[PDB]
Amino acid sequence: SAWPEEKNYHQPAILNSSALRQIAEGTSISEMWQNDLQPLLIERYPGSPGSYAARQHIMQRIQRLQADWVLEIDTFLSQTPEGERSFSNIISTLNPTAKRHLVLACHYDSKYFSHWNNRVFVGATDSAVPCAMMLELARALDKKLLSLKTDSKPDLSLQLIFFDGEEAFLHWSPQDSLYGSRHLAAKMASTPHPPGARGTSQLHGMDLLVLLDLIGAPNPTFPNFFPNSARWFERLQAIEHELHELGLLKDHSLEGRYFQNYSYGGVIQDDHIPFLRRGVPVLHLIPSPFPEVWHTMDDNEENLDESTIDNLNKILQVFVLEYLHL
Numbered sequence: 001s002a003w004p005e006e007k008n009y010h011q012p013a014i015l016n017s018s019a020l021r022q023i024a025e026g027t028s029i030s031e032m033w034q035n036d037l038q039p040l041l042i043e044r045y046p047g048s049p050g051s052y053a054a055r056q057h058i059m060q061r062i063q064r065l066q067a068d069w070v071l072e073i074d075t076f077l078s079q080t081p082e083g084e085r086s087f088s089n090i091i092s093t094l095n096p097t098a099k100r101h102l103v104l105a106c107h108y109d110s111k112y113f114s115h116w117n118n119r120v121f122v123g124a125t126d127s128a129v130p131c132a133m134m135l136e137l138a139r140a141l142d143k144k145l146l147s148l149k150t151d152s153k154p155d156l157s158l159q160l161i162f163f164d165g166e167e168a169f170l171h172w173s174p175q176d177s178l179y180g181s182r183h184l185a186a187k188m189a190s191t192p193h194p195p196g197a198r199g200t201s202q203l204h205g206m207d208l209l210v211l212l213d214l215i216g217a218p219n220p221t222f223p224n225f226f227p228n229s230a231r232w233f234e235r236l237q238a239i240e241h242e243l244h245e246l247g248l249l250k251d252h253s254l255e256g257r258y259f260q261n262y263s264y265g266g267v268i269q270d271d272h273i274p275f276l277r278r279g280v281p282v283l284h285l286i287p288s289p290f291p292e293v294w295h296t297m298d299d300n301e302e303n304l305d306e307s308t309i310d311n312l313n314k315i316l317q318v319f320v321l322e323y324l325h326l
């Protein structure tokens with residue numbers, strides 16, 4: 001069976017003008033700010049009070065949606081620099097037994113830092129905002145998504161991952177990093193899918209991994225990293241332009257735009273690595289450069305850009321709708 005190949009040929013359903021208008025009007029940046037983003041701007045390294053609440057906040061937010069979301073906690077112990085630690089990835093699937101899933105993901109953990117001048121690192125852009133935008137997407141699209149509960153469709157739904165312990169504890173290295181991802185990846189790699197199949201694993205299931213990281217500084221530039229996924233990048237470029245055209249953005253210029261058609265110099269380590277090395281198509285939505293306030297106490301809410309997150313919300317939402325033909 002050649003269904004793992006279905007993703008290679010899969011095409012989008014290009015929304016038309018008024019559709020795009022209606023998506024734009026559908027997402028409230030401020031609803032998100034207050035309810036999605038704000039609660040997560042807390043110290044939330046693994047095992048911390050913040051961790052448990054962060055995790056509880058996310059499931060609270062999803063559980064309140066009507067689309068038949070299936071939540072699931074990948075909790076595991078692993079050795080670390082600071083000694084043994086419990087990690088818990090949050091997965092959220094619509095239609096889990098569907099062969100194919102588009103997958104959005106980020107990291108809910110934050111990096112550890114000593115309380116330099118009674119200040120606390122909350123990792124705004126890194127990646128509380130990614131988390132919020134995902135949860136906003138989940139909301140903004142509830143009605144539309146609820147239809148994926150019902151002959152004439154590809155066997156494809158949506159999945160959200162929120163990886164834990166992405167961040168390094170001490171020195172970033174193969175073994176002090178990507179704790180959450182490394183584990184789930186290996187688990188998926190060996191979990192048969194669909195249940196009772198020969199050969200094909202849950203990783204065959206991931207049509208595409210869309211990984212949001214370090215998002216919320218103004219004027220981010222995303223490079224196109226992956227050739228094997230460069231066509232979806234192009235859709236993102238198109239959608240950005242389209243909405244700009246219809247004037248459905250706020251404070252945006254084509255000269256100062258987000259998705260640039262250039263490649264990237266080095267190779268960026270993130271949650272996608274364990275997936276990508278197993279031949280998942282990845283779409284790495286991480287800005288190059290990173291925000292100024294990267295791994296600083298300045299990575300705070302004072303320093304996010306309201307308009308930038310909102311615009312991206314609009315872009316990412318259209319992308320996903322088109323990807324799912326909704």
Ligand SMILES: Cn1cnnc1C1CCN(c2ncccc2-c2ccc(F)nc2)CC1
Nearest residue numbers: 126168172173213214268269270271286295
């Ligand atoms: C993806 N992400 C989110 N927050 N920080 C990151 C990256 C992870 C990969 N990075 C590294 N790559 C190679 C060697 C070291 C690092 C690194 C990671 C964390 C840190 F504090 N300092 C360096 C840069 C920061």
Ligand SMILES: [Co+2]
Nearest residue numbers: 111126167295
């Ligand atoms: Co970081």
